[PDB]
Design a protein around this nucleic acid. Structure first.
Lengths: 429, 104
DNA sequence: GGAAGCGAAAGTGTCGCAACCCGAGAGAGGAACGATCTCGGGTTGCGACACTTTCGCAACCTAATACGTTCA
RNA sequence: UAGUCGGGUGAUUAGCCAGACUCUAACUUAUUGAACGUA
């Protein structure tokens, strides 16, 4: 066998959640490349990513240690408070290559005082993880890189427990990455200088994904070794970077370090497989960075699955509509499916995505002037497509407020011209 | 503790004697056995249990006979679920109940 | 003897939180040069958990038999 | 007092007679195997 047909995709297919954290019954399909969940601010989407992280923790536990019992659900929180069933199931299917196209898992938890011990069925996932561990021990094989990144990664900033392989799984899930471990690991790599290529891969990774950063290194000043970057041409330390800049650098650097240790045999260790969950990929970012986050992520990690939540139209404008999963605004009536948006989003206007996918008008309704232009339209059509005192006053108001070159004023001029031509041709016809 | 564990959940697990501090040092068996028998009326006049534990390092385990406890606790729990009943109270108040009043 | 999953028992590691030091700094209050009071970095201690590990509960029964009881 | 043994009535219950009490019952496992029956 070719390392047991491992060195074939390796990703998640489906996730069922039954009586688990307000999810009476919710089944979600997931794309091999990128799935994005929208609709909530991160209450139910955090539950979804938390369930996926609980499921992945078993893979981690069994790849690390034989018989390892990954995280279990909680009888106190991970069970719907109002459920005649009195147990919660978190089932999930995986797909790993042509062979073993369906690796199931269930994490079950029943309340205290129930006749049958509703029990997790983790045997097949454990078997696959044990295959991973055994074939790796026999011969080195690149392994999946599971990670989780919630809003807790916005946090301020031992050779044994930072340089040895399989440290990539330490606190890999559970949220905020171990950027301090990455800092120490990078300083250690610099001290050592295979480590050279790893250093270079991480450098190129965070130089390309992060727009502001253009270089990274460390000064080995006697008594204090500092990690420095070139942010906007300024040679600064990590403590100097902005919140968004350093938070995204920590995310990408933690991920890259995990992939570099986990994927030693790849020519590009950033193209190893994995399932990375990212709550609010837009955190602390500006529209310009939003418009490139996913492109950069998918470029630096060619073969990896991303389950990322988001509430920014600019982000969705870069993702195919198939990948999107909409929560309904009336989720109180628990729904069994997450349908993709009817409108295409990739390559579309951010304004259109915002208006339809998210139901957010292009101009706020709290501002009176925001309605002015629209009102003008109606008024023009009220007086047989001709100006009167009201429409003239509204036109003057638009011209004064928005300006002379104002797009609003240009469109008002176009509207009046079109209506006047309407009337002229009606007279002529 | 096995009564409590198996009323909390079928197939549960209760406390266990220790292989470092629960077996007599002068003993030749190198294992301790807390046998016990409870009573729950004419029906279940005898409910045996045996919490047994071997000494650390000896290559001879000693299984524990908690199955009758599993059975009686199963009756309690299942009957409680089907219809509400009154369960048995189990408590241990040793010297550790003396502690500062520091401030599911 | 013991699978599968789960939890007890035990041991080791993490990591806030506190304690404390050691420069700075504006400037007593009256005599110059500045006591005291603070603002910070930064190091070490220190115990409450958090994670790692092992043990141990007990499913299962190609090879039986098939009048009714009792009893290992 | 309590537990216990188990003579009849009534129908695994209830209930009337006896009785005795080493600190001190708790009724078991079938197709093997004895023992009972039966054929």
């Amino acid at each position: 066998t070719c390392r047991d047909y491992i060195q074939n995709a390796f990703y998640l297919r489906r996730l069922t959640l039954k009586d688990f954290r307000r999810f009476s019954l919710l089944e979600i399909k997931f794309e091999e490349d990128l799935t994005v969940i929208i609709g909530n601010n991160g209450k139910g989407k955090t539950s979804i990513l938390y369930a996926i992280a609980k499921t992945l923790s078993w893979f981690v536990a069994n790849i690390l240690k034989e018989g390892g019992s990954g995280q279990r659900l909680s009888e106190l929180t991970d069970i719907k408070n109002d459920a005649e069933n009195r147990y919660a199931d978190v089932s999930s299917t995986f797909f790993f290559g042509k062979g073993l196209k369906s690796v199931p898992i269930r994490l079950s938890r029943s309340a205290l005082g129930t006749a049958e011990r509703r029990d997790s069925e983790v045997k097949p996932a454990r078997d696959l993880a044990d295959i991973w561990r055994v074939i790796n021990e026999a011969k080195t094989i690149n392994l999946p890189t599971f990670a989780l990144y919630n809003v807790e990664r916005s946090q301020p900033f031992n050779a044994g427990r930072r340089e040895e392989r399989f440290d990539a799984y330490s606190q890999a899930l559970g949220g905020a990455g171990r950027f301090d471990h990455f800092v120490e690991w990078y300083i250690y790599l610099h001290k050592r200088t295979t480590e050279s290529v790893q250093k270079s891969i991480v450098e190129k990774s965070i130089c390309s994904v992060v727009p502001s950063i253009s270089k990274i290194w460390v000064e080995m000043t006697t008594g204090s070794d500092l990690v420095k970057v070139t942010n906007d041409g300024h040679d600064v330390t990590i403590d100097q970077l902005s919140d968004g800049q350093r938070v995204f650098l920590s995310l990408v650097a933690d991920l890259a370090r995990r992939m570099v240790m986990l994927n030693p045999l790849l020519e590009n260790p950033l193209e190893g497989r994995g399932i990375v969950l990212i709550d609010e990929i837009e955190l602390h970012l500006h529209p310009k960075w939003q418009q490139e986050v996913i492109l950069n992520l998918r470029s630096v990690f060619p073969n990896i699955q991303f389950i990322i939540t988001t509430h920014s139209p600019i982000v969705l404008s870069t993702i195919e509509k198939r990948c999107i999963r909409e929560f309904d605004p009336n989720d109180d009536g628990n729904q069994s499916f997450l349908d993709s948006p009817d409108m295409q989003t990739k390559g579309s206007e951010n304004a259109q995505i915002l208006e339809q996918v998210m139901n957010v008008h292009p101009t706020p309704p709290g501002i009176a002037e925001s309605h002015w232009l629209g009102d003008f339209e109606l008024l023009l059509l009220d007086n047989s497509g001709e100006l009167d005192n009201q429409s003239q006053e509204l036109y003057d108001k638009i011209k004064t407020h928005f300006g002379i070159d104002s797009a609003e004023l240009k469109k008002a001029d176009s509207l009046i011209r079109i209506n006047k031509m309407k009337n002229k041709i009606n007279k002529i016809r | 503790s096995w009564f409590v564990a198996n009323i909390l959940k079928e197939g549960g697990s209760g406390q266990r004697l220790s292989e470092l501090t629960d077996i007599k040092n002068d003993a030749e068996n190198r294992y301790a056995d807390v046998s016990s028998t409870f009573f729950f009326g004419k029906g279940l006049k005898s409910v045996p249990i045996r919490l047994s534990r071997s000494a650390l390092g000896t290559a001879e385990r000693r299984d524990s006979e908690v199955k009758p406890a599993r059975d009686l606790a199963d009756i309690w729990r299942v009957i409680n679920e089907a219809k509400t009943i009154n369960l048995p109270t189990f408590a241990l108040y040793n010297v550790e109940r003396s502690q500062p009043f520091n401030r599911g």
